[PDB]
Amino acid sequence: RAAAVTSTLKARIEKMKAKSRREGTTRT
Amino acid sequence: ASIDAFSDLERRMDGFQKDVAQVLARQQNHVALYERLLQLRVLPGASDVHDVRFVFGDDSRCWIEVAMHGDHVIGNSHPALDPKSRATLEHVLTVQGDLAAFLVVARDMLLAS
Amino acid sequence: DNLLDNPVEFLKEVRESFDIQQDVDAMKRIRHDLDVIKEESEARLKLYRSLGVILDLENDQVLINRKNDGNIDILPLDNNLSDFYKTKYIWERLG
Amino acid sequence: ASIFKDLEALSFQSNASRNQDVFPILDLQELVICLQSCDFALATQENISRPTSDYMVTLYKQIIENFMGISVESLLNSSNQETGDNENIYLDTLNVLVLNKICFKFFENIGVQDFNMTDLYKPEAQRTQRLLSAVVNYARFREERMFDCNSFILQMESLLGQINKLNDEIKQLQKDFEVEVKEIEIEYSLLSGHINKYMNEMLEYMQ
Amino acid sequence: ARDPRPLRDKNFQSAIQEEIYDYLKKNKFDIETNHPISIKFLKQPTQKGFIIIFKWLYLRLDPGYGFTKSIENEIYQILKNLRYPFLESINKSQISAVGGSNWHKFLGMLHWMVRTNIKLDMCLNKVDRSLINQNTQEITILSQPLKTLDEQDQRQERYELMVEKLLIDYFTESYKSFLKLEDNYEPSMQELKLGFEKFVHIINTDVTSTELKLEELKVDLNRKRYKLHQQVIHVIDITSKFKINIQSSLENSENELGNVIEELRNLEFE
């Protein structure tokens, strides 16, 4: 039933991708 | 490269992961500490023609400025000192050539004033 | 199913999220910052060095060298007042 | 060319017939057609009209091995093996006589009672067609009544079919899993190289 | 080119005379043909009696042979086909009257035939036993502990050979009856049905074995795949944890050193 480890691991992947694509300065 | 051999690479990862921790060991300031220990800071002078100002204590109680860019070696001082104390300090930087001697004498005059 | 819908893509995604350049660039900036700290601390650190106050952080003590000998007593950094206390020792033992 | 069965074909005064064998004596061309159709490709009108030894030896060995389902060679081998774990005086004679006996027993079963060394080692035309005519009659007998045994063949082919289909299933499942394993193994190898590449670059800026 | 046997030696002649006499007497030669056999006759024989002995021996080697009207004219050819090792040493002219000076060559020939006869019987006995043995090889091999297809795929041809040998038995016997003007083959057919039931039983064992192996490989593959996926989970779990953890270390160090650099550059007197 509780095989949500995949979501837990995919959460890490999505964090890593968000850090790679991040642009520091942002305005308006 | 077989996934059954992943424990070999896992071991390397655990090692390298801690090699990072060693390299990034929090280097101390070495200057905030000396200022914290001695209550002595080295700052540029207010009149930047006379460059170096040395500040004693936690607050702006004692400071003195030095130039060696013209004829005036000794800048000003927040607690004023007589000319005789100022001539002795100007010779110590010229005929004695010892910062430490100049530093101990200046703070003793200033802290008592 | 307690299985993986697509283990091949799963692994591929992790590799494609394993940004190498980002971390290498970070290391370059860290090395740069160390050079900046070193170069901008150098002149002040020698003035404090000419005072004779030499510092060991390998072994948790501070040295004083203003008596023409290496026998001046050290001061530990732990369990101390510093309320006119550390400063006093490092001004009364100094020529 | 230059071979004359043309004057061998002058079978004068052939109209009245006599044949003490129970099986019919076949004319050469029909005899060869039947022998070839029994998958003795080696049988030809030319060789059978002028039989030579080593041709008849080969052909008889092929016929006997087909209709009896045994290896003549294996029989000669067991003929020479001795009990224990100056005899070449007899070996060639024994091998030649053992082959003769094998043919002898075979032909007794099909209406020929007097197979002998001449038929193998100095063959003559009429005896050769007589013997081979007995072979064809037996083959025709087998073909006609082979529908008596069709149920056995079909059952055997079904059962062999079930083995093969199941073994195909086994290899399909075991092949597909091997594909699954490798595609994971391929992708893991990429990731393993990626992590090693990462550490190698990071080490350049450490220590 | 020459006969190595010491044919002229009188002891050798005495010996082989006994051996020829013993075999002929034991095997009812003097009874099957009315001609009596004796050591004296082999000492110096008659031409008529020699041909009787030669014909009697050769028929034991080649029972279907049809002797011509004048046996003297085919003895040489018979020995050539027999591949008599001492053929060259015997000239075709002396076969006409063997009782003369050259009798030793023909006494030695008779002894060799006796020895060939003795040895042929042993050969044929071994051949007979081999036939019996070969009739069971397949059911014996096919009923051995079964191996996987990777090391026995010719198994199918072994089954087909076993069924073909059953049909060969059926039609061989039926044909014997057919040439006897008989038409009922139910005995042979019942015999074929019984043997075929043996075939069905043994291959039925292969079907059941293979079926059980197939259902068991399914279970084994399911377990192996689950274990492999867990291995993949482990790789992904700690690779991601590895990368994020060092990303944290890099981030903390950079903010640490940035704050140091601000202090080094904060020259406000205040």
Author numbering:
A (entry chain E): 861 to 888
B (entry chain D): 2 to 31, 138 to 220
C (entry chain C): 5 to 48, 162 to 212
D (entry chain B): -15 to 69, 76 to 152, 406 to 450
E (entry chain A): 113 to 318, 621 to 684
Paper text:
Ndc80 is part of a rod-like assembly, the Ndc80 complex, a heterotetramer composed of two coiled-coil heterodimers, joined end-to-end in parallel orientations. The globular domain at the N-terminal end of Ndc80:Nuf2 contacts microtubules; the globular domain at the C-terminal end of Spc24:Spc25 interacts, through two distinct adaptors, with the chromatin-proximal inner kinetochore. A further component of the response to erroneous attachment is the plus-end microtubule polymerase, Stu2 (the yeast ortholog of XMAP215/ch-TOG in metazoans). We describe experiments here in which we found that a C-terminal segment (CTS) of Stu2 bound specifically at the junction of the Ndc80:Nuf2 and Spc24:Spc25 heterodimers and that conserved features of the four-chain overlap at that junction were important for the interaction.
We instead used the ‘dwarf’ version of Ndc80c (Ndc80cdwarf) in which the coiled-coil shaft between the globular heads has been shortened to facilitate crystallization. We co-crystallized the Ndc80cdwarf with a 33-mer Stu2 peptide (Stu2 residues 855–888) and determined the structure of the complex by molecular replacement using the published Ndc80cdwarf structure as a search model. Clearly defined density in the resulting map corresponded to residues 862–888; there was no density corresponding to the N-terminal seven residues, and the C-terminal residues, 881–888, were part of a crystal-packing contact with the Nuf2 globular head of an Ndc80c symmetry mate. This lattice interaction may account for the somewhat different unit-cell dimensions in our crystals from those of the unliganded Ndc80cdwarf in the same space group, as well as for the nearly full occupancy but slightly higher local thermal parameters, as determined by refinement, for the low affinity peptide, which did not diffuse out during the short soak in cryopreservative. The peptide binds at the junction of the two heterodimeric subcomplexes, contributing a fifth α helix, and packs at about 30° to the main axis of the four overlapping helices from Ndc80, Nuf2, Spc24, and Spc25. Four conserved hydrophobic-residue side chains in the Stu2 CTS (V865, L869, I873, and M876) fit into hydrophobic pockets lined by conserved residues of Ndc80 and Spc24, and in a conserved polar contact, the side chain of Stu2 R872 inserts between D651 and S654 on Ndc80. As now shown here, the Stu2 CTS adds a fifth helix to the four-helix bundle, without producing any conformational rearrangements, indicating that the role of the junction is simply to anchor Stu2 along the Ndc80c rod, rather than to receive an allosteric signal from it. Fluorescence polarization binding experiments showed that the CTS binds dwarf Ndc80c with a dissociation constant of approximately 48 µM. The immobilized Ndc80cdwarf did not bind any mutant version of the Stu2 C-terminus.
